[PDB]
Amino acid sequence: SIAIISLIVEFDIKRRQAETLSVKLMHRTALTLCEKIRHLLVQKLQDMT
RNA sequence: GAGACUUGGGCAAUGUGACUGCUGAUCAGCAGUCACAUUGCCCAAGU
């Protein structure tokens, strides 16, 4: 969970500094899937929590 | 001697007025110097 949180900011900064529209979109998809992975992880953590 | 009057040498201040000089800080413009950040490229290694 902590590593995926770090990946959130890494993808955020790479998307912010990216220029090509294709690269922008690819970074956005990577960040979205990073959020989904985080959500599955934390939802599994919290139902047990 | 008593004195009045004037220029002096001044001693004082109560005013009041104006002049001159300097320091410091702030801002703006310009010039230059320190470090730091970002996107790259390439190389050196070790397993």
Curated annotation (Swiss-Prot):
Tissues where the protein occurs: In ovary (at protein level).
Phenotype caused by lack of the gene: Abolishes RNA-induced silencing complex (RISC) assembly and RNAi silencing activity. Abolishes siRNA unwinding prior to loading onto the RNA-induced silencing complex (RISC). Decreased levels of endo-siRNAs. Increased susceptibility to infection with RNA viruses such as Flock House virus, Drosophila C virus or Sindbis virus. No effect on the processing of pre-miRNAs. RNAi-mediated knockdown inhibits the induction of the antifungal peptide Drs in response to M.luteus challenge. Also highly susceptible to infection with A.fumigatus, with 80% of flies dying six days after infection.
Protein family per UniProt: Belongs to the helicase family. Dicer subfamily.
Protein origin, superkingdom: Eukaryota
Description of how the protein assembles with itself and partners: Component of the siRNA-directed RISC loading complex (siRLC), composed of at least Dcr-2, r2d2 and Taf11, which processes dsRNAs into duplex siRNAs which they then load onto AGO2 to initiate formation of the RNA-induced silencing complex (siRISC). The Dcr-2-r2d2 complex exists as a heterodimer and heterotetramer, with the latter showing higher siRNA binding activity. Interacts (via N-terminus) with the siRISC loading cofactor r2d2; interaction is essential for formation of the siRLC and consequently, formation of the siRISC. Interacts with Taf11.
Places the protein is found: Nucleus; Cytoplasm; Cytoplasm, Cytoplasmic ribonucleoprotein granule
Domain comment as written in the entry: When in complex with loqs isoform PD (loqs-PD), undergoes significant conformational changes during the full ATP-dependent dicing reaction cycle for processing a 50 bp dsRNA with a 3' two-nucleotide overhang and a 5' monophosphate terminus. At the initial dsRNA binding stage, the helicase and DUF283 domains transition from an extended to a closed conformation, this anchors the bound dsRNA through major and minor groove recognition and forms the ATP- and 5'-phosphate binding pockets required for dicing activity. The N-terminal helicase domain, containing the Helicase ATP-binding, Helicase C-terminal and Helicase insertion domains, functions in dsRNA stimulated ATPase activity and RNA translocation during the dicing reaction. Essential for processing endogenous and viral dsRNAs. Binds and hydrolyzes ATP enabling the dicer to translocate along the long dsRNA substrates, and produce siRNAs processively from the end. Some reports suggest the domain is essential for the recognition and initial binding of both blunt (BLT) and 3' overhanging (3'ovr) termini dsRNA substrates.
Primary role: Double-stranded RNA (dsRNA) endoribonuclease which cleaves endogenous (endo), exogenous (exo), and viral dsRNAs to produce short interfering RNAs (siRNAs). The generated siRNAs then mediate gene silencing, also called RNA interference (RNAi), by controlling the elimination of endogenous transcripts from mobile and repetitive DNA elements of the genome as well as exogenous RNA of viral origin. Also acts in an RNAi-independent manner to activate translation through cytoplasmic polyadenylation.
Name of this chain's protein: Endoribonuclease Dcr-2
